[PDB]
Design a protein around this ligand. Structure first.
Ligand SMILES: [Mg+2]
Ligand SMILES: [Mg+2]
Ligand SMILES: [Mg+2]
Ligand SMILES: [Mg+2]
Ligand SMILES: [Mg+2]
Ligand SMILES: [Mg+2]
Ligand SMILES: [Mg+2]
Ligand SMILES: [Mg+2]
Ligand SMILES: [Mg+2]
Ligand SMILES: [Mg+2]
Ligand SMILES: [Mg+2]
Ligand SMILES: [Mg+2]
Ligand SMILES: [Mg+2]
Ligand SMILES: [Mg+2]
Ligand SMILES: [Mg+2]
Ligand SMILES: [Mg+2]
Ligand SMILES: [Mg+2]
Ligand SMILES: [Mg+2]
Ligand SMILES: [Mg+2]
Ligand SMILES: [Mg+2]
Ligand SMILES: [Mg+2]
Ligand SMILES: [Mg+2]
Ligand SMILES: [Mg+2]
Ligand SMILES: [Mg+2]
Ligand SMILES: [Mg+2]
Ligand SMILES: [Mg+2]
Ligand SMILES: [Mg+2]
Lengths: 67, 223, 96, 57, 107
RNA sequence: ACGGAAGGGCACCACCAGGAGUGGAGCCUGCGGCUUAAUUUGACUCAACACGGGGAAACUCACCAGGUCCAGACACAAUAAGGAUUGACAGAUUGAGAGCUCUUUCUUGAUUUUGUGGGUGGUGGUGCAUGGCCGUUCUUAGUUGGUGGAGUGAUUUGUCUGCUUAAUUGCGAUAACGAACGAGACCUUAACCUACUAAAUAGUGGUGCUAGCAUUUGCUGGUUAUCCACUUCUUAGAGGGACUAUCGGUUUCAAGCCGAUGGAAGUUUGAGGCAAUAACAGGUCUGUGAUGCCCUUAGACGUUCUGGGCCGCACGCGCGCUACACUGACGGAGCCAGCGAGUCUAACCUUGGCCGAGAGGUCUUGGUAAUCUUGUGAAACUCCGUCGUGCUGGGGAUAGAGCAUUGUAAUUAUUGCUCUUCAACGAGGAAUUCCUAGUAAGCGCAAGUCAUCAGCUUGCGUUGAUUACGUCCCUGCCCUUUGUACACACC
């Protein structure tokens, strides 16, 4: 299953929380964003986080999401 | 001479293994810990990291002169092709091995069990540890076996950061009744990791934005 | 142990001058590294020398690490009839 | 040790680390018979110390 | 007055890549920084010493097998230098963990 | 905590759908049992039985028949220089060129003897006295604390109907909010880089030097340096790459899930390493100079040496190997891996040259190794033949005779080769194991062990499927609900 752990979800909240101007429905740039803007120890966890912030930003667009 | 490279490094390892044993046996009442081995042009340089170095040096340098002679006469070095050095470990409150050796010396000195172990933690934690832990297995005063957990602070137990961040030690301490096992576990703060990763991989930090005072219809500056 | 006095000298001497002795746990050597006696002769000699104080014994990984003590310093001082302030491994080498 | 006398354990433990810190802080500043071994057998090597004669019949 | 081009080969072996490479990178930048003539760090296959045991000290249990290993990494670099810098290059660049070995010649 | 109550779940150590089997046979191998001088011993549901790395000719070794020695520290006391004690040639003796013992009579010189005390070793007992380690529960998903809510209190809520996940994984519900351990993250390995740094210990193209065949240029080789260039393949440092992306179905349009495109890769990317709290009288004192206490300690339970035994054979059990053939046996012939290892104060990995039918012998030789063995020219496999369904040329047990190698030693046959002998077994009753993709199954090889010995194990690559992609029927476990007079907790 591809259910995302609490850390991934939690951090995707926090990012959209404080960086909606900057960020996009694009993973790649959100990924690079996550670099110059946060500190994640491993490449994997980072795209894990970017991929899911990119999800959330893309569905925020069509109505809000609780959280 | 003339040995294979595979067999050379394997061999090299065993040499250290024997050394660390022999010292651990000899320099217990001097808070021995590890042995950084260091071979050079000219020499091989064993550096003994104890805590009570004057009790390793001895009368104007006598006992280290023994230990060299020892380590020399056995591993068949030529006189002055191998040297020894005392080296006070940087704060013993984070070297499990030193902390284990304590509880041994503690318990062995008729110290209350909860007292020894609890204080051992209270000294490690006070030595700026991120967390620490003391198992006492074995059997005391009464026939049955029993064990205890003694832990304060924060530990981790799984994966690679184990390797990086937690010191482990076990030491059998042997009393009038039998033998009980001391196990010590220290968690070092990843913040001060020096030469390594500086956090748990677990960790995600977000840089904190900025109050923006927007507005201001266009305008330009010339230079 | 039972052994001829000459061989006792060889050991006692060598221990005095060196202050330290070693020996692999292996009776049946009949001649050990350095000292010209039977290995069995070496080990038991010190094992006595130890069990009457004088010197300390260590083991680890099969090799008997012999440390002479101050009390035994005076005792070999006796055996080899050599004067107070004689020697042992108590010289700071050259300028080493 | 029973959980009844618990408190005075932790305290005796606390004060134990108070002493462990005391000594660990006051150890941050705190306060020739020669002749040799082979050179006394070489020095007493001026002989006159044996005897020898036999071999006959 | 002295000096003569020697055609040298330093072989670096160890199980501590970071330092191993720290000493290896050190050798090449330093020596080329004062212009020699060389073959750059040659990595021969990292080779992997396995040891495969039973976990049990005794006999009983699910027969769980365990396999330890020790990784021996080995570099070498060829240098042409005078007599001076070579000795200057061997006595330093020292490292507790890296097995430096300096050979010579064309045979 | 437990139930021989109730409702839910999970999983190829469960079934479904199938594959390959074992169970039958011959032998190999463990266990029992019998026998025995002795056949050393641990362990007996999963979680004992090709396990103790347990492949025992000596050793190992613990067992049996016997023979030596003290390596009995130290202290006191005794003997005692008029010699405390030590050794032995020959003979007898003994398995023995053990002065074990004896005769006989030298030697030795304070080292020992004797006695008590105290030690000491022991694969002697105790794993129901312990450490440590390991196995199991566990192919599991659980544990805890701050602030708030309830409660006199132990406590509880958080930590939950539901949905979702491999997961107390999440969404969502919500007197809870927001966190930590564990899961995940992490690490290792296998996949992708014509981008980055390079290579005579890896390799490519050109060129020389050169061979053969064609000749019109061509084609297939030789040549550890004759030079020039490169880094696609090889190697390994550094980065990059993937986040279930894009699109779309689907569901509380929540987490998710399913399909299509793209992609080296989209089942936790495949596979592992690591792994919380807790439980067990699980196993291990026979790994340990880890260890308590008991035992024993000179006609020894110490040690060593000589020989046998662990392999003993009416039979019961388990893991295995090999087969019952025609998708085959045989004989030529093609000819292709990958993980490994290998010799210093030494005889390891071994090419090539002879000799030999073979096993092997012999002379040299390269290698402490990406450099030499080795392109490990491995095996199934592919082809062209022979045989023709007949216990047949399927099968190769048992057995005779011979030649070799290891080793001080090969008898009870270490193993190897040759001739001959040619058994059962014609697909296996009740039962029962394992498994979902480069997997199963077939097939070899390297490493462990190892003087010699793999029908074992650990990894490896080669060939390469059929059937699922579901469920709760069987079994196992997990969870709530519930009863308890259990709490040393249904032993
Ligand atoms: Mg993990
Ligand atoms: Mg079925
Ligand atoms: Mg069947
Ligand atoms: Mg025997
Ligand atoms: Mg006595
Ligand atoms: Mg037990
Ligand atoms: Mg145990
Ligand atoms: Mg028993
Ligand atoms: Mg499975
Ligand atoms: Mg209240
Ligand atoms: Mg609950
Ligand atoms: Mg964690
Ligand atoms: Mg490349
Ligand atoms: Mg496709
Ligand atoms: Mg039991
Ligand atoms: Mg044990
Ligand atoms: Mg023992
Ligand atoms: Mg057996
Ligand atoms: Mg089995
Ligand atoms: Mg046949
Ligand atoms: Mg064929
Ligand atoms: Mg012939
Ligand atoms: Mg040679
Ligand atoms: Mg036939
Ligand atoms: Mg083998
Ligand atoms: Mg076996
Ligand atoms: Mg109740």
């Amino acid at each position: 299953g591809r259910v995302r752990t609490k850390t991934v979800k939690r951090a995707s909240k926090a990012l959209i929380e404080r960086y909606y101007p900057k960020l996009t429905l694009d993973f790649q740039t959100n990924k690079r964003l996550c670099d110059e803007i946060a500190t994640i120890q491993s490449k994997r966890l980072r795209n894990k986080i970017a991929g899911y912030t990119t999800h959330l930003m893309k569905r925020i667009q069509k109505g809000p999401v609780r959280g | 001479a003339l040995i294979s490279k595979k067999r050379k490094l394997v061999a090299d390892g065993v040499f250290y293994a024997e050394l660390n044993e022999f010292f651990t046996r000899e320099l217990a009442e001097e808070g021995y810990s590890g042995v950084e081995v260091r071979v050079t042009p000219t020499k091989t340089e064993v550096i003994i990291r104890a805590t009570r170095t004057q009790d390793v040096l001895g009368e104007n340098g006598r006992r280290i002169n023994e230990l060299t002679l020892l380590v020399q006469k056995r591993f068949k070095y030529a006189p002055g092709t191998i040297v020894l050095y005392a080296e006070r470990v940087q704060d013993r409150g984070l070297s499990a091995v030193a902390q284990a050796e304590s509880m041994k010396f503690k318990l062995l000195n008729g110290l209350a069990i909860r007292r020894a172990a609890y204080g051992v933690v209270r000294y490690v934690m006070e030595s700026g540890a991120k967390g620490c832990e003391v198992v006492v297995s074995g059997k005391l005063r009464a026939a049955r076996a029993k064990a205890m957990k003694f832990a304060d602070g924060f530990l981790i137990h799984s994966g690679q950061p184990v390797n990086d961040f937690i010191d482990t030690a076990t030491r059998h301490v042997l009393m009038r009744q039998g033998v009980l096992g001391i196990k010590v576990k220290i968690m070092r703060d990843p913040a001060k990791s020096r030469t390594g990763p500086k956090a748990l991989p677990d960790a995600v930090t977000i840089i904190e934005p900025k109050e923006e005072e927007p507005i201001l219809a266009p305008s330009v500056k010339d230079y | 142990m039972l052994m001829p006095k000459e061989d006792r000298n060889k050991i006692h001497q060598y221990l005095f001058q060196e202050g330290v002795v070693v020996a692999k746990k292996d009776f049946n050597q009949a001649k050990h590294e350095e000292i010209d006696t039977k290995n069995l002769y070496v080990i038991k000699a010190l094992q006595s020398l130890t069990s009457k104080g004088y010197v300390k014994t260590q083991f680890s990984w099969q090799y008997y690490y012999y440390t002479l003590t101050e009390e035994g310093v005076e005792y070999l001082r006796e055996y080899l009839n050599l004067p107070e302030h004689i020697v042992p491994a108590t010289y700071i080498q050259e300028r080493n | 040790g029973d959980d009844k006398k618990e408190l005075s354990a932790e305290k005796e433990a606390q004060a134990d680390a108070a002493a462990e810190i005391a000594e660990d802080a006051a150890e941050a500043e705190d306060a020739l018979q020669d002749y040799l071994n082979q050179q006394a057998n070489n020095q007493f090597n001026k002989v006159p110390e044996a005897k020898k004669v036999e071999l006959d019949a | 007055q002295q000096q003569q081009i020697i055609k040298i080969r330093i072989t670096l072996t160890s199980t501590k890549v970071k330092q191993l490479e720290n000493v290896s990178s050190n050798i090449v930048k330093n020596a080329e920084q004062h212009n020699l003539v060389k073959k750059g760090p040659v990595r021969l296959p990292t080779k992997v010493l396995k040891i495969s045991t039973r976990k049990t000290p005794n006999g009983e249990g699910s027969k769980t097998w365990e396999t330890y290993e020790m990784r021996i990494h080995k570099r070498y670099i060829d240098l042409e230098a005078p007599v001076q810098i070579v000795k200057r290059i061997t006595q330093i660049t020292i490292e507790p963990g890296v097995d430096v070995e300096v050979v010579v010649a064309s045979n």
